[PDB]
Amino acid sequence: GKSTIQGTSYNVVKFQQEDVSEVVKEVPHFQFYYIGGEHKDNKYRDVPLDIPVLTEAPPPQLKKPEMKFSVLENGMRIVSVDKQGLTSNLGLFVHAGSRFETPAEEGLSHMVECVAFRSTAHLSHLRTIKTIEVLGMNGGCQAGREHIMYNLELLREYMPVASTLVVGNVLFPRLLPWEVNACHKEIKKAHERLKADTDQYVSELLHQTAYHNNTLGNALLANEGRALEHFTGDNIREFMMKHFSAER
Amino acid sequence: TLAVYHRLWGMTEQFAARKKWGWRQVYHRMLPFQIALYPSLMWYLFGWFDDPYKEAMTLGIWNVSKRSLYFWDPLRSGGDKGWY
Numbered sequence A: 001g002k003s004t005i006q007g008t009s010y011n012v013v014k015f016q017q018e019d020v021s022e023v024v025k026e027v028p029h030f031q032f033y034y035i036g037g038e039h040k041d042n043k044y045r046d047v048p049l050d051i052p053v054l055t056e057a058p059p060p061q062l063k064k065p066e067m068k069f070s071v072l073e074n075g076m077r078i079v080s081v082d083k084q085g086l087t088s089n090l091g092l093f094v095h096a097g098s099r100f101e102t103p104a105e106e107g108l109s110h111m112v113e114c115v116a117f118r119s120t121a122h123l124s125h126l127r128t129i130k131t132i133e134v135l136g137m138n139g140g141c142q143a144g145r146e147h148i149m150y151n152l153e154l155l156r157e158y159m160p161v162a163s164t165l166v167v168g169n170v171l172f173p174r175l176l177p178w179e180v181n182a183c184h185k186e187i188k189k190a191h192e193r194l195k196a197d198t199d200q201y202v203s204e205l206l207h208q209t210a211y212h213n214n215t216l217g218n219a220l221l222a223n224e225g226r227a228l229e230h231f232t233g234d235n236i237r238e239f240m241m242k243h244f245s246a247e248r
Numbered sequence B: 001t002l003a004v005y006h007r008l009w010g011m012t013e014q015f016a017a018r019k020k021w022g023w024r025q026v027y028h029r030m031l032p033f034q035i036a037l038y039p040s041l042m043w044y045l046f047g048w049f050d051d052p053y054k055e056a057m058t059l060g061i062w063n064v065s066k067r068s069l070y071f072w073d074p075l076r077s078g079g080d081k082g083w084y
C-alpha cells in the first residue's frame, strides 16, 4: 500500500508514456466486416452432443479470489475481484447523485444518466453503441440519490474495449446540442418505469415526505415541464465540472 | 486508449470492399435462374432458326420428319418437296 484514502490503503499506479503503435498490438482482436472467408465444413456435424469431443484440456488453475485495491495518480480508485468467471462486470461509480442538486438544478443528475454513452471526443454516439452491441455487451447508466453508476457486462477478453468506453463518459463527453435534445424523450420513459413498480414508487414518496425539500428528498427523476429549460449540454457540463472528478 | 480508438476507427476502413462482396453474394444467388431463362428463350425462338440448326440444337431429336402432318406451310408438309 502506497496511499491511504478515506481509511483504505491503495497501491499507487504510475502513469507511463507508451507509443500508440506498441499498445495497438495488445488490443483484443475482433472484426466488424467479414469480406470473404475460408470455407470449412462443420467437423462435428455428425457427432451427437452426448459424445465428448475435446481432448488434452490444460489442467485448471484455481486461485482463491481476493479483492485488490489500487489508485491512479489522478485519484481514481480501482477495486477488482477475480472469481475466474468468464463474464466481467465493469462499473464506474461517481459520487454525484440527486442529493447534491440545488433547487435551480433540479433533475440534472437524471439528465446526466440520460446522455450516457453519447458522443465523446474520440467516438461518435453510433460507433459507441454499435461496438457495445457487436461485442455482445449489455449495460447502461443509473443515477441514484448519492451516486451515478455506469456498468457493462461482457466477455472478459474484451475488457480493454469496455473500460475505454465507460471512462469516455466522464473523461471527455461531447454534450452536443442536438444529441442532448434527443434525450428529452427518456424523461417520460423514466417516469413510466418508476410508477410501474408500485413498491419503488411508494419508496420515492416516502423519501420526498421524510426529507422535505432537502438532500435525500430531492426527486430522483427530472420533470418534463420547467426542468427542460436547463436540459442542455452547457448546463450538464457545468454540473459535471462541479461534482464529477477522479477523486469522487 | 488511443490504440483502442484506432482499432474502432479502422474496423470499417474497407467499406467499399465489403459492400461489393454483399452485392456479389446477391448476384451469386441469382445465377440459378439461368437454368429456366435460357431454355425458355430458345423455346420461344425455336421457329426462328433454320432447320439444320433446329436439328443440331435438339441433338437430332427434331428433324424435318418431325414436322406436323399438316405443316403451317401446306406445300411443305412431308418435306420441302411435298410427300411425293
Ligand SMILES: CCCCCCCCCCCCCCCCCC(=O)OC[C@H](COP(=O)([O-])OCC[N+](C)(C)C)OC(=O)CCCCCCCCCCCCCCCCC
Residues within 6 Å of the ligand: B052, B053, B056, B057
Ligand atoms: C467433356 C465433355 C465435352 C462435352 C462437349 C463435347 C462433346 C459432346 C458430345 C459429342 C458431340 C460433340 C459436338 C458435335 C456438334 C455437331 C453439330 C453440327 O455439326 O450440327 C450440324 C449443324 C448443321 O451443319 P450442316 O448444315 O453442315 O449439316 C450437318 C450435316 N448432316 C446434315 C449430315 C448432319 O451445324 C451446327 O449446328 C454447328 C454448330 C456448332 C456450334 C459450336 C459452338 C461452340 C461454342 C460457342 C460458344 C459461344 C459463347 C461464347 C462465350 C464467350 C465468353 C463469355
Ligand SMILES: CCCCCCCCCCCCCCCCCC(=O)OC[C@H](COP(=O)([O-])OCC[N+](C)(C)C)OC(=O)CCCCCCCCCCCCCCCCC
Residues within 6 Å of the ligand: B055, B056, B059, B060, B061
Ligand atoms: C473429353 C472427352 C469427351 C467425350 C467422351 C466420350 C463419350 C461421348 C462421345 C460422343 C461422340 C460421338 C457422337 C456421335 C454423333 C453422331 C451424330 C450423327 O451421326 O448424327 C446424324 C444425324 C442425322 O443426319 P442426317 O440429317 O443426314 O439424317 C440422315 C437421315 N436418313 C438416314 C434417314 C437419310 O445428324 C444430326 O442429327 C445432326 C446433329 C447431330 C447431333 C448433335 C451432335 C452429336 C451429339 C452426340 C450425343 C451423344 C449422346 C448419346 C446419344 C444421344 C441421343 C439419343
Ligand SMILES: CCCCCCCC/C=C/CCCCCCCC(=O)OC[C@H](COP(=O)(O)OCCN)OC(=O)CCCCCCC/C=C/CCCCCCCC
Residues within 6 Å of the ligand: B044, B045, B046, B047, B048, B049, B050, B051
Ligand atoms: C418483361 C417484358 C417482356 C416482353 C416480352 C415481349 C414478347 C416476346 C414474344 C416472343 C416471341 C418469340 C419469337 C417468335 C418467333 C416465331 C417463329 C416462327 O413461328 O417462325 C415463323 C416463320 C418461320 O419461317 P420459316 O420458313 O421456317 O423460315 C424462318 C427462318 N428459319 O418466320 C420466322 O421464323 C421469322 C422469325 C423472326 C424472329 C426474329 C427474332 C429477333 C427479334 C429481335 C427482337 C429484339 C427485341 C429488343 C427489345 C428491347 C426493349 C428495350
